């Protein structure tokens, strides 16, 4: 169950797709880990997520109100901490889908 392996390349933190050593980001609910390169994570997420309770795409929840359901599936993932936030939970309120990288209110105050 706690097997520290990658779901994309079946490799551990000691060996990546190209035998490259790098820590693995294991889901705090499923325990499934994956390399930042395999998960297409950002340099900030790699260091920002390794120090916080990370959740996979099927576990990611809202940090503002902290809820689940249909709206929880349409939330936005932070490009700085990978925290999910409902479209309406974003601070300030989300006007429209931003073409590019999104960052939660916890990472970018108002």
Contact residues toward Zn ion (CB under 5 A) are: 6, 8-9, 11, 27, 29-30, 35, 38, 56, 59, 62, 64-65, 78, 80-81, 83, 86, 89, 104, 106-107
Helix extents (H) in 24-81: 43-49, 70-73
Helix extents (H) in the chain: 43-49, 70-73
Smallest distance, Zn ion to C-beta of residue 96, A = 18
Smallest distance, Zn ion to C-beta of residue 102, A = 9
DSSP-assigned letter for residue 70: H
Structure tokens at 83: 């925290």
Smallest distance, Zn ion to C-beta of residue 98, A = 14
Q: What are phi and psi of 47, to 5 degrees?
A: -95, -25
């Amino acid at each position: 169950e706690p097997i520290p392996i990658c779901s994309f390349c079946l490799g551990t933190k000691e060996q990546n797709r190209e035998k490259k050593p790098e820590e693995l980001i294991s889901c705090a609910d499923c325990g499934n880990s994956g390399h930042p390169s395999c998960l297409k994570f950002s340099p900030e997420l790699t260091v920002r997520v390794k120090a916080l309770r990370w959740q996979c795409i099927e576990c990611k929840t809202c940090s503002s109100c902290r809820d689940q359901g249909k709206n929880a599936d349409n939330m936005l993932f932070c490009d700085s901490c990978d925290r999910g936030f409902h479209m309406e939970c974003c601070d300030p309120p989300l006007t429209r889908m931003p073409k590019g990288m999104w960052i939660c209110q916890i990472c970018r105050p108002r």
